[PDB]
Amino acid sequence: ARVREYSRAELVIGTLCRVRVYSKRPAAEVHAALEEVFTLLQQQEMVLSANRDDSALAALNAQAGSAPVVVDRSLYALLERALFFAEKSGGTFNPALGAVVKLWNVPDPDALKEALTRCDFRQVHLRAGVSVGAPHTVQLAQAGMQLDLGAIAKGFLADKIVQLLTAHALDSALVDLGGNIFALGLKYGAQRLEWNVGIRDPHGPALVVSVRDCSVVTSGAYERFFERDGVRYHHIIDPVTGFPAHTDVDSVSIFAPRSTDADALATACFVLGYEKSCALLREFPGVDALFIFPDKRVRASAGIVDRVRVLDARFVLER
Ligand SMILES: Nc1nc(Cl)nc2c1ncn2[C@@H]1O[C@H](COP(=O)(O)OP(=O)(O)O)[C@@H](O)[C@H]1O
Ligand SMILES: [Mg+2]
Ligand SMILES: [Mg+2]
To answer: What single-letter DSSP state applies at residue 244?
Structure first.
């Protein structure tokens, strides 16, 4: 049985999604798995998207202030994890920030102060009965509050894809959802090697990190922004100010066995800045982190620093 390499990519969930697979299984089996990957992404766009009017999330937001809404167990589990990170991050990750995000999607100061009164994630009530077949429900108790899962959905979907690939007996893959990476297993050279994941120059890869069975997710200011009167406004909001976060790092990359967790923590850490991020990350010892600073210094945690290679010599890896 010969090793074959396959890839497939499509525009879906608002970005370019690519999956690369190495396998000795029959090609028809790999093709079927990749078909199901991209069917899954299409279906989940219709569940999770905060920027379509016809998604399940949009339907849920339309019921803010009203009765509990039945959701499927997958969406419930994502919300559960999002609220966990909201609590652990001290609200710097906030999945109930849609009222503010939608205004930035420069907004007026009062209009903005008003939106900030409708972002209390502690008013998202998840309830699920314990008896057989009991429904999962979500209630948004604060009128006008709006969920936005943009800071965790790609991580969640990368995890779901890894689960699907493994269900199809695939153990070597590179999942790339708009730069939200999961490195499954080892790649092939007959040698088996770690996947080499590049991290971009925030102002541009600058660095490459060798990983196995690991998600690599980066949050940064220069991923998405607009400019007005000489000021840049990026897409990661500080929930305290309602404005794009002022932070001492240009990007944070999180390395975690679950992409859901890497994505949420990457956003939280960006808002928190370097010193508070290191404190938070002590609570997640199975996670590693790499920080790129505006002066092009790079700091990486002990679990990954020996796997980091600088490709752009303007950057310096502190050891
Ligand atoms: N403090 C915050 N907490 C949370 Cl919970 N969500 C936030 C947030 N500020 C913005 N958002 C939303 O989340 C996306 C960024 O999510 P990201 O993973 O950091 O960046 P990428 O898009 O490159 O993956 C943005 O567009 C917004 O929709
Ligand atoms: Mg995120
Ligand atoms: Mg993300």
So the answer is: B
Q: In this structure, what token pair is assigned to residue 276? A: 């508070």
Ligand 1 pocket test: which of 81, 101, 226, 241 has the largest number of ligand atoms within 8 Å of its C-beta?
Answer: 101
Domain ranges of the chain: 1-319
Resolution value, angstrom units: 1.5
The sign of the torsion formed by the CA atoms of 63, 67, 69, 75 equals positive
219 CA: nearest ligand 1 atom: 19
- Starting at the edge strand found earlier in the chain, the sheet holding 69-71 runs 69-71, 136-140, 124-128
Q: Is 61 exposed, middle or buried (0-12, 13-18, 19+ CB in 10 A)?
A: buried
Q: Is the CB of 101 under 6 A from ligand 1?
A: yes
User: How far does residue 220's CA lie from ligand 2's centre (Å)?
Assistant: 10
Q: Is the CB of 235 under 6 A from ligand 1?
A: yes
Experimental method: X-ray
